[PDB]
Amino acid sequence: GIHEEMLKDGIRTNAYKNAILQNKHLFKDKVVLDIGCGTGILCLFAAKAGAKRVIGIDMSDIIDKARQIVSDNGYSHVIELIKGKVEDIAQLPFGIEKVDIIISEWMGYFLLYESMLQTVLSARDRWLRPGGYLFPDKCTMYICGIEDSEYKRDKIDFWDNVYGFNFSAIKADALREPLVDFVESQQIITTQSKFLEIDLNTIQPEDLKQITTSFEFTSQYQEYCQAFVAWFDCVFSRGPHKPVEFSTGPFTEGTHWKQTVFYLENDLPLKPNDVIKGTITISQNKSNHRDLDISMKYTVNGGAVISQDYIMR
Amino acid sequence: TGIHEEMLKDGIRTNAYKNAILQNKHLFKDKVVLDIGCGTGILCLFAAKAGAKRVIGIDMSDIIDKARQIVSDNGYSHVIELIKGKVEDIAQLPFGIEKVDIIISEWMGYFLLYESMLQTVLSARDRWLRPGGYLFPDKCTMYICGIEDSEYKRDKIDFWDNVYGFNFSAIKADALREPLVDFVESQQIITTQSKFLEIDLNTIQPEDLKQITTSFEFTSQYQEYCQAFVAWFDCVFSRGPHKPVEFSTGPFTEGTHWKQTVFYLENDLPLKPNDVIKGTITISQNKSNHRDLDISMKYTVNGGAVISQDYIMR
Ligand SMILES: Nc1ncnc2c1ncn2[C@@H]1O[C@H](CSCC[C@H](N)C(=O)O)[C@@H](O)[C@H]1O
Ligand SMILES: Nc1ncnc2c1ncn2[C@@H]1O[C@H](CSCC[C@H](N)C(=O)O)[C@@H](O)[C@H]1O
Known part of the structure; x- marks a missing residue:
């Protein structure tokens, strides 16, 4: 039920959509990670923008429907999805240890209530290469x-x-x-x-x-x-x-x-x-x-x- | 607590219960009343105001605490007794009471039956309702x-x-x-x-x-x-x-x-x-x-x- 509300949030989704696809030269060949990918909509945005490798993390079983969405849109070779809490991930897949960009829909009500902010900064300190980008920051x-x-x-x-x-x-x-x-x-x-x-x-x-x-x-x-x-x-x-x-x-x-x-x-x-x-x-x-x-x-x-x-x- | 504000602001629903009870004071007077999922106790208060001799409210959430105060605040502590627990876990009704004359319950779920309390109301009817007793609603x-x-x-x-x-x-x-x-x-x-x-x-x-x-x-x-x-x-x-x-x-x-x-x-x-x-x-x-x-x-x-x-x- 969450992801329909998210995707029907036009003002929200279009902001992420514009900031990603309107800088394709920035994203091309970067490695991108998406904290709480959900249906994978932003992973799809990063892949469409030109990312070589995209990683989605999500704790619910929405990870399954996302695999199918990504397979249906022809990016399964690019977008890799992991089911679990970020804090339970031993290592990112394929021996990757650094990323170029972190994407997250993390803002809660009143910004900070039931927000993922404390999770994003953990993925930032663990994986973001010096000078990496955070969408948003x-x-x-x-x-x-x-x-x-x-x-x-x-x-x-x-x-x-x-x-x-x-x-x-x-x-x-x-x-x-x-x-x-x-x-x-x-x-x-x-x-x-x-x-x-x-x-x-x-x-x-x-x-x-x-x-x-x-x-x-x-x-x-x-x-x-x-x-x-x-x-x-x-x-x-x-x-x-x-x-x-x-x-x-x-x-x-x-x-x-x-x-x-x-x-x-x-x-x-x-x-x-x-x-x-x-x-x-x-x-x-x-x-x-x-x-x-x-x-x-x-x-x-x-x-x-x-x-x-x-x-x- | 968000549930009970929603329930209480539902005017068509609450007034039907209000009308079914307070419009039959002669029916309710001196009865023993049982309230399955009493919440804030509004229906207990309806029953007590209707003339009931003894009202018992059961509820599993901690909202029963606020209901205790509400009942004391409206001067019915002597009539209305509230018990915390699942109805299916209550050993006995209090005060050595073994039967009740009326059962009131807000049990209907979405689509009437989804996540409804119906099967709980029915054990309370089979455990405690005297032959020919009333169910509000039935x-x-x-x-x-x-x-x-x-x-x-x-x-x-x-x-x-x-x-x-x-x-x-x-x-x-x-x-x-x-x-x-x-x-x-x-x-x-x-x-x-x-x-x-x-x-x-x-x-x-x-x-x-x-x-x-x-x-x-x-x-x-x-x-x-x-x-x-x-x-x-x-x-x-x-x-x-x-x-x-x-x-x-x-x-x-x-x-x-x-x-x-x-x-x-x-x-x-x-x-x-x-x-x-x-x-x-x-x-x-x-x-x-x-x-x-x-x-x-x-x-x-x-x-x-x-x-x-x-x-x-x-
Ligand atoms: N600690 C955590 N570890 C992994 N996933 C998490 C998490 N906390 C929240 N999530 C996931 O984060 C998602 C946020 S909803 C946002 C989804 C997506 N970015 C979009 O814009 O459409 C939820 O699906 C939830 O399952
Ligand atoms: N098995 C159970 N045992 C005891 N209480 C239950 C229960 N299942 C649901 N309840 C309680 O039933 C209540 C239903 S809401 C109805 C509250 C009140 N009768 C009114 O109309 O305003 C909830 O407060 C819930 O806590």
Whole structure:
């Protein structure tokens, strides 16, 4: 079910498609490895671009349907597929020990949740020759404040009266869950703050154990603000002769990632030119490591510190 | 927890249960009530508010903890007792209770039967339900008809012929075997509706569910191509209410969270008005995953040659 959503993600798939096939001279005779190949669509892109040898890794049984897809499209001699977790691979096949390029569809929701980032960097440190390329290599995260009163009454305030009963005991866990959904451009009531940047060319895995950063944006209206919305941008920076990018924000057409919406326990009554400045800290949950802890502490006009904690479960 | 928000925001479903219970307070008053898969306890609260003397909720997930608080918060701790565990693992009901007067359960799965709690409801009925007790709800019937759905068949099935210039037809086979759980507009229905299954939880034996064999018949009303069949189930709170309560999950009423189940035809049927599509459906537990649903169809158009298709709901 995943790969239909992936392949129907036009904005996503076309970005990878353009960055690969629009630099055929770059790819020709290179050895390419594709972390999480799935149906093999990107392996097919690299092979079509001219790669001499392509390796796909994938842990599910989708590896089987991919072999057939690749055999059907006449690249079985070029594209070699391995079933398994990257972390279980003794050696790449055929005694290959270095690769020229690493391809991965690794970005999760909120970029980092259930992402393969920690896997890509492991394949990068094990196999990527000095100066190799990563498609993609650079991500920046943004955030801003929105007016979203209709949805906050519906997903948050709803538990105060459920068929006449008082279900407020759930209200806390509703606020703790960030919402993955689409936000309309009209709802934004502030400027946008860039609060994180990952460069897979240089970022070291240790620098991900706990991420500490901050954000700043200014309100433009006298308005109550009920949530913050984050999203990430992607660049195939190094490799193409002109850069390729796609966004997951609300100013362009949607991707399957949507946006991430973070509900404020108390609405901030903002006035124009109010300065919202704050700290975000992001780390893997202590108990279930596939969960994402995200803590926020912020102020409005250097005022008292509002703090909220979120778990992406 | 994502399940229970979805369940509770399903208005058509929750109000049917709300109506079947609170509209018979004289029936429920002083009864002992059992709730299979109580969740947040909303139905227990319906039962307690209805006048029940004792309500018991069973649930295997940890949501039972939040339900304890919700019950205490709405002032029913003395009525409603909650137990954590699988119903099939409960040694005895609490307090030395050995029989109950009413069983409430939200058990219906997708396509009514896929990953349904039906066989759990039935052990709880055979273990604890007094002779002549009530099951909320007790009778479900399934319907089927044929639709015009060419735009979505081109998009969900024909998509695999060329994805970004490559040939992905190897995916096509498994795409057709997977029934689509989704909403279909009534406007697309091009045939009469065939009722092809009926379950009465008062009398059905669990064994009679391992393999269900039945049939269906519906008539085309238009000159039109038909690309899929759509099935759905209705629910009735038959015995207990003095005027019956029901809700549907079909495309002529408001949507519920179950939506509809769509069965794509490998070959489109060019139908004419008054064509008769008649067939056998058989539904059985998959051999490899027992929680997977095998669904087999063999049918004709005007008694012509037998078209047959097989599906797995995984
Ligand atoms: N640690 C790991 N080792 C090997 N494969 C992994 C993995 N973690 C995730 N995967 C695989 O990565 C895939 C990500 S989906 C992306 C598929 C493909 N690159 C495309 O764009 O269409 C999943 O199919 C999953 O099976
Ligand atoms: N074998 C089993 N034993 C106990 N609880 C079960 C069970 N199988 C499913 N359940 C529970 O049944 C619930 C069904 S969801 C329905 C919740 C509630 N009755 C409502 O309508 O709002 C789930 O919470 C699940 O935890």
